[PDB]
Write a protein that binds this ligand. Sequence first.
Ligand SMILES: NC(=O)c1ncc(N[C@H]2CCCNC2)c2nc(-c3ccc(Cl)cc3)cn12
Length: 256
Amino acid sequence: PFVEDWDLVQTLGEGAGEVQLAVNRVTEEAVAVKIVNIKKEICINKMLNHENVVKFYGHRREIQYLFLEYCSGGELFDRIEPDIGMPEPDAQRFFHQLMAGVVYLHGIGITHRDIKPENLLLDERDNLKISDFGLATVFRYNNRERLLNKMCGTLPYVAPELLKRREFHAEPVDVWSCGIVLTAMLAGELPWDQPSDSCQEYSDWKEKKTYLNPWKKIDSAPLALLHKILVENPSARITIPDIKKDRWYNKPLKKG
Ligand SMILES: NC(=O)c1ncc(N[C@H]2CCCNC2)c2nc(-c3ccc(Cl)cc3)cn12
């Protein structure tokens, strides 16, 4: 066990330390407790205020204890059936929410840098919340953008420029990773280990061999969006404002 007025029940997961479920045995309030960038993660977390971003309640040192909004729905990762994905209507809804969360972060000059299904949680209402800001950083301050120069993230989810460029813009990288997540949601598999020239799967994609997995499992509509997101040249890659105007993005979907 317990921290101050909170008792720790179970180990909900773990980064990397351990994420525990805490209950204010008195007020019965339930929140997530993460046990331990760290300094920056807290600083960044303190700026976060959005319905699609895990809320930060506070921290305590004592090993720093981060108190976060509890998402009982777990990771989006576990809603993805291997080799199958999930119903398109569910995928679209999660993607809508992911975009809302990313737009917000980018609007406050914050880049997540580690968007993946393991870092996207769901509340009791199955609302998506962006989580795990341990790799996040500021890319815009005083209205002045700063290019990124460090390589952070998770290989299957990183944009190709991150592996080939000295410096790169932060936004297009987060957008790319969102497209990898969309791919996973609709195909139940990742398209490649990494977006490098030495990767057969990536080369096949650039060569537009969509008759191969996982592209063949994806409907033409969402697939056309993926064609705009997973663009090698970050300056040609689709932006969020344009994603929001995409045909599939705006397609009414019914399940079942
Ligand atoms: N803020 C939360 O709530 C929360 N934060 C982080 C979690 N795990 C990390 C682990 C490392 C990768 N990123 C996610 C996590 N797992 C659950 C959960 C909820 C319900 C079930 Cl059934 C299982 C896990 C809830 N959370």
